[PDB]
Amino acid sequence: LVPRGSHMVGLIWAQATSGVIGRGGDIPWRLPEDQAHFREITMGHTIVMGRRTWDSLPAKVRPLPGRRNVVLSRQADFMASGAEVVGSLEEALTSPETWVIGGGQVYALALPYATRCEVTEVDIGLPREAGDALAPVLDETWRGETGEWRFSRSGLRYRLYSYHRS
Numbered sequence: 001l002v003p004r005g006s007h008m009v010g011l012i013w014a015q016a017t018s019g020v021i022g023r024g025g026d027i028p029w030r031l032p033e034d035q036a037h038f039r040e041i042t043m044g045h046t047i048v049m050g051r052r053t054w055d056s057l058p059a060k061v062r063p064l065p066g067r068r069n070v071v072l073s074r075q076a077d078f079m080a081s082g083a084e085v086v087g088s089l090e091e092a093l094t095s096p097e098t099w100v101i102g103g104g105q106v107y108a109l110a111l112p113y114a115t116r117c118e119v120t121e122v123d124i125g126l127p128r129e130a131g132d133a134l135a136p137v138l139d140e141t142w143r144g145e146t147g148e149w150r151f152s153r154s155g156l157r158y159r160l161y162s163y164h165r166s
């Protein structure tokens with residue numbers, strides 16, 4: 001759907017109902033259904049992540065396979081084997097389609113350029129706590145479809161939102 005001369009930027013994240021996406025350097029739930037969803041959307045694309053999200057990736061999927069991994073860091077000497085490290089968002093968003101995959105800092109940086117958000121809401125009542133990474137706030141310029149609740153294999157409930165804007 002994307003003309004090759006354009007620059008589509010999308011954000012994709014999974015959040016608790018409270019907006020928590022990250023805590024203690026990790027994602028504070030386990031949801032294989034969301035991993036599969038994230039993989040289906042991002043496979044084959046350039047993905048952009050902050051350095052702390054690179055650190056948070058399980059070693060088995062660091063780099064995330066089948067995607068061009070781009071890591072934003074101000075550390076010139078940062079070691080991200082199998083990825084590329086860029087010092088600015090400008091060098092990160094050169095592809096016709098980019099998926100920004102976290103974390104809290106980088107979603108805030110990228111949201112003003114984005115025209116798609118793919119959001120998984122996890123029906124888990126984790127209260128926001130000091131130091132948590134949080135999902136970005138979407139204003140009224142965004143619109144989209146809210147999916148139905150589904151139970152994961154474990155009985156954890158989740159639903160998918162597909163948002164877009166002009």
Ligand SMILES: NC(=O)c1ccc[n+]([C@@H]2O[C@H](COP(=O)([O-])OP(=O)(O)OC[C@H]3O[C@@H](n4cnc5c(N)ncnc54)[C@H](OP(=O)(O)O)[C@@H]3O)[C@@H](O)[C@H]2O)c1
Pocket residue numbers: 012013014015020021022023024025026027049050051052053054056072073074075078086087088089101102103104105106107109133
């Ligand atoms: N639930 C989800 O969908 C999801 C997805 C992804 C991540 N997470 C979780 O979110 C947390 C990580 O989020 P976070 O907000 O703490 O960190 P982050 O956004 O992943 O990374 C922050 C790092 O990115 C670099 N950075 C930020 N802005 C930059 C800029 N303008 N230019 C160059 N570099 C920049 C800096 O790296 P340097 O310090 O190296 O300079 C900064 O420390 C983890 O808990 C992770 O597991 C959740």
Ligand SMILES: CCc1nc(N)nc(N)c1OCCCOc1ccccc1CCS(=O)(=O)NC(C)=O
Pocket residue numbers: 012013014027034035036038039057058061064065100101102118119120
């Ligand atoms: C899955 C978490 C997540 N969900 C959404 N909706 N958006 C995100 N940005 C997001 O974070 C992505 C970075 C953390 O990714 C993971 C963390 C723990 C386990 C597995 C993966 C992915 C591995 S995968 O499914 O992409 N690839 C293979 C080969 O498993």
